[PDB]
Write a protein that binds this ligand. Structure first.
Ligand SMILES: c1cnc2cc3c(cc2n1)[C@@H]1CNC[C@H]3C1
Length: 278
């Protein structure tokens, strides 16, 4: 009579916004109440938590990215097209873990390598290969998740033979300040990052196609769907409802304009008519 589900996120702006959207949709369209949980860390943290489940100090639902799941299935970085990534993780997670991938939200939040526009013009940079030829002169500032993830810098560095003068691990917001001030020359910008809006940066082309697609989708434990089958349709109301530009704008409302992510998520859903006004 008082059933609850746990929606998890790791700790970054987009993750919390989209987890909040999932929680708001569930509470708007079902009789379930939602525990919102934040998990410390990056790679495989939400995956392990959902394997435990909300009844065992874990989570029942979170928004995963196809490429992050794909690299864990394969055991080595590989590239593919959006459908290849999505269908592979959907079938594998269902068969191995009884985890259900719902429909993609609509955006691809990939890792990138990004430089200031002026630096790109100064050195004629368009591609990762262009950058690698001169990386020995440059400093990379990047997030811990990118530097430590199996699908992040370790394999990219080996494939392109990147040789930066110095490589610094940085918090998410401050790497944008650091590249704006030329404390570093390259950052691992993420494609939906809010602060890409306010900095004059150039996203370089991954010409060897190292990275897989990173399409966000809600995923849920099958036993939670068995108990509450309505969830499937409710969460699929978000299907293709968030473009890259929309997600970027929401992220900037938090990171650039100081709004809290709960407010940003709820007002977005109200604007799009996905939940009721008032
Ligand atoms: C480990 C686990 N999940 C991640 C999710 C994301 C990232 C890194 C992760 N690393 C950023 C790049 N892909 C989508 C977001 C943001």
């Amino acid at each position: 009579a008082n059933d609850t589900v746990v929606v998890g996120s790791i700790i970054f702006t987009e993750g919390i916004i989209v987890a909040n959207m999932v929680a708001e949709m569930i509470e708007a369209h079902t009789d379930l109440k939602v525990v919102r949980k934040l998990n410390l860390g990056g790679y495989n943290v939400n995956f392990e938590a959902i394997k435990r489940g909300g009844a065992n100090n874990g989570i029942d639902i979170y928004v995963e990215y196809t490429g992050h799941g794909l690299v864990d299935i394969l055991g080595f970085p590989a590239t593919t097209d959006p459908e290849g990534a999505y269908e592979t993780v959907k079938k594998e997670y269902k068969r191995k873990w009884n985890i259900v991938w719902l429909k993609p939200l609509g955006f691809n939040n990939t890792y990138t390598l990004t430089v200031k526009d002026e630096l790109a013009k100064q050195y004629n940079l368009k591609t990762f290969s262009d950058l690698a030829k001169i990386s020995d002169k440059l400093i990379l500032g990047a997030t811990m998740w990118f530097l430590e993830g199996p699908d992040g810098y370790p394999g990219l560095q080996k494939l392109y033979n990147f040789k930066f003068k110095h490589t610094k691990s940085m918090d998410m917001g401050i790497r944008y300040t650091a590249i704006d001030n030329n404390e570093v020359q390259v950052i691992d910008a993420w494609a939906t990052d809010g602060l890409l809006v306010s900095h004059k940066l150039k996203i370089l082309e991954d010409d060897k196609a190292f990275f897989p697609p990173y399409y966000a989708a809600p995923i849920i434990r099958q036993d939670v769907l068995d108990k509450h089958p309505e969830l499937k349709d409710v969460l699929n109301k978000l299907a293709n409802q968030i473009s890259l530009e929309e997600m970027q704008k929401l992220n900037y409302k938090v990171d650039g304009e100081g709004q809290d992510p709960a407010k940003v998520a709820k007002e977005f859903l109200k604007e799009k008519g996905l939940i009721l006004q008032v």
